[PDB]
Design a protein around this ligand. Structure first.
Ligand code: B12
Ligand code: SF4
Lengths: 309, 442
């Protein structure tokens, strides 16, 4: 007979738990490469969030807005529909916090964060507006307001960490650590974070990915390096990985431009762009996939049922 | 590649002829010229087999399907992860065509297949093969189906049918070097003789790793090494397992029966499911993937994923950093500043021409890096861009002094205006906004 070649892996990706009580979701824990359960264990499958903006999106493609059209102005109702669409976790992006936008304050954002958290049965991930100075101001307020719920706060970077990490330690939250597609940058940021005594199982690495055709292959390899680092004993690499799928996939001209004759049917290619990005990075060893279109989530969840079979 | 003499020293030395050859020394000579495999000698010790088989050689054979301009080459992969070293040969993509179709329908479908070709980053990328299937279960029909298809395309073929169907179609098609599908435990002697007769590559097909390896060994024993492997997964869980093992065992264990490229089918009637299974097979180790869809929107994502996965990170992708003209601009046309990463250049060129805007595009030399990448790296400077404006000759091509920055670099504008002497406009963050910017602001 053929002797199946089984790697003996030294170590594992830590298991991170998000949420609390009956709201928890676990991810990571892998002692093997994705799906190869003949050589190790996959205690958890990949997990999925859908996005909710606190104030409605002004640039989205019509095909993206449609599935949400009835709830899209109400971040609470929207989040409930995400859960009904099959999301494991809801990702609330606070766009209104933007200084050139509505520029909402810490106190105000804090209240909207509570309202969403309160209305749903799953963990809540909270994303800032992307302006570091502003996000460092609002997160300590939001975290205190949500204290004890174990939200995922997104995110910490090499030049902005301490505020978001301190809120996690004081108020019982988990953090996303973002570094730009580099193994050593990601490690150096995990080290700084753990030096504040935030536990290793409270962290999730964000590679800052590109989508299909847009740098997905760089993302793919960084994520494989993250998994292989974890498995071979490198403990600084031993944390689960988040990819913001929807954020990137839906910026692609292929996803957002309804007339290109050469590219065929728009509906098909728009969704493929997200699903193919998702599956590629699932194959690469990603854990948490933050998506946008409920149809993309639905087909990927089906693919997963098949590949776990 | 060892000489018969070399490989003879380890043989049983019985001269019992059971391998088909007159003597051990002459058996070794048959294998040295690739006329027979080690598995043809029943008595060769497992030690000697390991010594001989573990001798230096590429772990995965390079197999060619087709000939001329349209030839496909796959194989010669040495690694399990692209960061270890690159993936060498992009997997072929094939589209199924069934011979139950009318002659007219066959031609129209193969015509559509010819159209799956796409510009990615200023290069054409296309589907490589037509897989003709003998679903009619009639030899004469299959043969006329293949001839008909060949009238409308230069793409190489995979021929899926019974030995009888294949033999009929090969009368015409054998000269185009098609891949045959497939030798099984039932038919392999007949399929190998047919393969040698036409000198064409041959798929070996059996269920699971055990049966695939035992079948390959009977076939290499008969001296046929031009081979593609089919473990017959029932779903994408079995496929990923089989593909991982076949690749691991060839490379890491030097396991020769697995030392060939594989074929994989994603035929699912749900296009999202088909595209996702194919995607897994692109990313993990499939030599050839066969699909059921002619819809460009289903193929575009797979073309692109194949391109990305099979890119060598070592190579910069860059355009000559000079002034480009779009739709014959006059002295009054807008001037767009961008970088020379080819992806970035063709994105911008694509939106400008798409909106039918005559214009100049100025890909500053970033060493092939994207707008924000080059910015973060200190490679898109006010000083650098200012030099381009001054020494590129654009100043003599336009009457006006205005140039337009990517919206994502807007913080550069003030210093650039001071250094260059040009009025600097900040355009949209995404080039998809150019059309509207020009209409409203230019
Ligand atoms: C792939 C990638 C790389 C690749 C390189 C690919 C390449 N050749 O540039 C690698 C991994 C090497 C690279 C490295 C780094 N990069 Co990088 N990486 C990216 C990534 C994931 C995609 C870049 C890409 O291909 N963009 C696609 C192209 C088409 O976009 P573009 O050129 O912006 O063009 C569009 C727009 O600008 C606009 N546009 C362009 N031209 C014009 C002109 C006009 C007139 C207008 C109106 C519009 C317009 O339209 C275009 C397309 O439609 C992004 C994150 C992301 N999701 O985008 C970062 C990112 C670009 N890079 C980041 C960083 C910091 C890095 C590094 C410095 C990290 C590090 N190692 O230190 C390095 C530095 C470079 C180096 N190698 O040292 C940063 C930039 C930080 C910043 N913006 O503030 C980003 C944003 C990630 C992050 N941190 O969030 N990375
Ligand atoms: S079968 Fe084996 S022992 Fe017999 S002649 Fe051939 S190589 Fe020699």
């Amino acid at each position: 007979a053929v002797e199946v070649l089984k790697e003996k892996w030294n170590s594992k990706v830590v298991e991170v738990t998000l949420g609390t009580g009956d709201k928890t979701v676990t991810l990571g824990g892998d002692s093997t490469l994705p799906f190869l359960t003949f050589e190790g264990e996959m205690p958890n499958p990949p997990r999925f969030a859908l996005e909710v903006f606190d104030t409605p999106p002004t640039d989205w493609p019509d095909i993206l807005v449609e599935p949400f059209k009835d709830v899209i102005n109400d971040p609470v109702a929207w989040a409930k529909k995400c859960v009904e669409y099959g999301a494991d976790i809801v990702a609330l992006r606070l766009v209104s916090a933007h200084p050139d936008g509505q520029n909402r304050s810490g106190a105000e954002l804090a209240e909207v964060c509570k309202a969403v958290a309160d209305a749903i049965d799953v963990p809540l991930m909270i994303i800032g507006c992307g302006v570091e100075e502003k996000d460092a101001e609002i997160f300590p307020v939001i975290g205190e307001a949500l204290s004890g719920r174990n939200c995922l706060l997104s995110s910490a970077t090499k030049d902005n960490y301490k505020p978001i990490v301190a809120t996690c330690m004081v108020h019982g939250h988990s953090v996303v650590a973002s570094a730009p597609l580099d193994i050593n940058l990601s490690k150096q940021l995990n080290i700084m974070i753990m030096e504040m005594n935030l536990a290793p199982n409270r962290i999730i690495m964000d590679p800052l990915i590109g989508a299909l055709g847009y740098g997905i292959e760089y993302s793919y390899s960084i994520i494989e390096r993250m998994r292989l680092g974890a498995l071979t004993g490198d403990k600084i690499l031993a944390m689960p990985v988040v990819c913001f799928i929807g954020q990137e996939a839906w910026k692609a001209k292929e996803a957002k431009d309804p007339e290109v004759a050469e590219w065929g049917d728009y509906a098909l290619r728009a969704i493929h762009w997200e699903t193919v990005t998702t599956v590629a990075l699932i194959q690469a060893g990603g854990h948490l996939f933050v998506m946008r279109h409920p149809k993309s989530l639905a087909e990927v969840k089906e693919h997963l049922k098949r590949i776990l079979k | 590649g060892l000489t018969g003499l070399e490989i003879y020293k380890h043989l049983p030395k019985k001269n019992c002829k059971e391998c088909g050859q007159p003597t051990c020394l002459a058996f070794a000579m048959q294998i040295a010229a690739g006329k027979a495999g080690l598995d043809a000698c029943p008595y060769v010790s497992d030690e000697a087999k390991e010594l001989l088989e573990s001798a230096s050689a590429p772990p995965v054979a390079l197999i060619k399907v087709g000939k001329g301009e349209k030839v496909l080459e796959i194989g010669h992969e040495t690694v399990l992860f692209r960061h270890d070293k690159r993936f060498e040969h992009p997997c072929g993509l094939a589209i199924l065509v069934e011979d139950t179709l009318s002659e007219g329908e066959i031609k129209e479908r193969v015509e559509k297949i010819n159209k799956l070709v796409f510009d990615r980053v200023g290069q054409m990328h296309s589907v490589n093969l037509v897989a003709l299937k003998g679903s009619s279960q009639d030899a004469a029909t299959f043969a006329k189906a293949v001839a008909t298809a060949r009238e409308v395309t230069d793409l190489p073929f995979i021929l899926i049918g019974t030995p009888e169907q294949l033999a009929a179609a090969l009368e015409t098609e054998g000269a185009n070097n098609p891949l045959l599908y497939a030798a099984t435990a039932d038919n392999y002697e007949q399929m190998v003789e047919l393969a040698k007769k036409y000198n064409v590559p041959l798929t070996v097909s059996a269920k699971g790793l055990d049966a695939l390896a035992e079948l390959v060994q009977k076939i290499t024993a008969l001296g046929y090494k031009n081979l593609i492997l089919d473990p017959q997964p029932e779903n994408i869980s079995e496929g990923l397992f089989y593909q991982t093992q076949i690749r691991r065992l060839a490379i890491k264990k030097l396991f020769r029966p697995f030392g060939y490229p594989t074929i994989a089918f994603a035929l699912d009637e749900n296009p999202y499911q088909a595209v996702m299974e194919a995607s897994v097979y692109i990313a993990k180790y499939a030599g050839i993937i066969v699909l059921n869809t002619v819809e460009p929107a289903d193929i575009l994502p797979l073309i692109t994923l194949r391109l990305n996965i099979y890119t060598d990170p070592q190579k910069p992708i860059a355009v000559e950093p000079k002034v480009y003209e779009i739709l014959n601009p006059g002295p009054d046309a807008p001037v767009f500043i961008t970088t020379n990463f080819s992806l970035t250049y063709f994105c911008v060129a694509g939106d400008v021409e798409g909106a039918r805007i005559p214009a100049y595009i100025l890909p500053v030399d970033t060493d092939g890096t994207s707008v924000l990448t080059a910015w973060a790296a200190g490679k898109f400077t006010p000083e650098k861009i200012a030099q381009f404006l001054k020494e590129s000759g654009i100043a003599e091509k336009v009457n006006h002094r205005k140039a337009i920055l990517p919206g994502g670099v807007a913080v550069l504008s003030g210093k650039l205006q001071e250094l260059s002497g040009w009025e600097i406009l900040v355009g949209p963050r995404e080039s998809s906004g150019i059309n509207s910017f020009i209409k409203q602001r230019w």
